[PDB]
């Protein structure tokens, strides 16, 4: 399959950030300020199978992440914090496909 954005839960992390539907998500990487000399270190993963996304959301462990994605063809990077759910306690962003 292919990982495409469809729905955005209002008020959820991505909604507070600015993710709009219909985006192609390429990469998910570690977030937060990096130490000098290590900005270009690769820790993230270039995604394609949509489950690689949700896998890399469980790896997030509630820590901030960057998303390198496509807006009508141009590359754009947005970073956010997955929120701890008050029910079963799972990190979410609010990103329906």
């Amino acid at each position: 399959v292919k990982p495409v954005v469809g729905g955005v839960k209002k008020g959820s992390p991505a909604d507070q950030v600015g993710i709009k539907p219909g985006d192609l998500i390429l990469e998910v990487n570690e977030g937060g300020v990096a130490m000098p000399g290590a900005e270009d270190d690769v820790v993230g993963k270039k995604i394609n199978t949509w489950y690689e996304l949700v896998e890399e959301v469980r790896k997030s462990q509630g820590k901030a992440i960057k998303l390198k994605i496509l807006r009508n063809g141009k590359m754009i990077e947005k970073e956010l914090i997955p929120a701890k759910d008050p029910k079963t306690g799972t990190y979410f962003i609010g990103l329906f496909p």
Partner: antibody
Amino acid sequence: EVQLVESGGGLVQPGRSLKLSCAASGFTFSNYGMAWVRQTPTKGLEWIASISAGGDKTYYGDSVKGRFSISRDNAKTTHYLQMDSLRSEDTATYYCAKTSRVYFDYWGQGVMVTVSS
Amino acid sequence: QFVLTQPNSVSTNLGSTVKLSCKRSTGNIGSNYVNWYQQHEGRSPTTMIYRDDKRPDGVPDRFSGSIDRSSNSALLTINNVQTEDEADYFCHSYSSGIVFGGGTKLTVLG
């Protein structure tokens, strides 16, 4: 398996220069920045310098006023610390350390620089 | 830009829990990651904790990290401390520069 093997230390006179080497292997060298960090019993750990994965951005610690320059030879999977105008107080054990965005994930075995006449 | 202060030494007992603190002098501690390194006598450092609270593979699960923003301090907790844990422990963070604490020497009597 990850290996960081340092070489190039020893004894140097005050006012002279010494270049250090750190031979890396066991991981994709060009995917990660590198750093040099020194240690003494009296001053603890002091960060010395870092160089980015693409070699195009360099970072110096405020313990050395530009006297040291850092370089990496990606074909030899190595990186270098050029130490100029050496001072008695620069005597220390020098480590190289691989970076992963936010921490030093592996350290070399160390080589010792002694500034003495 | 900031300094990280560690006790000079801590003495604890085989099997005890022990907490090692690391206090940031200026700027909010949560504003950048804290890491922890173990160094045995005469040996190279190895990672105990990185990214505030993640445990490298190979490290026993009796180590854990946390951040106490109210005291601007990072904490290394060792449960069920073992004699093999005698070592120096350095905390580490960064911002515009890279900063180490002065190191705590852990002694375990008993």
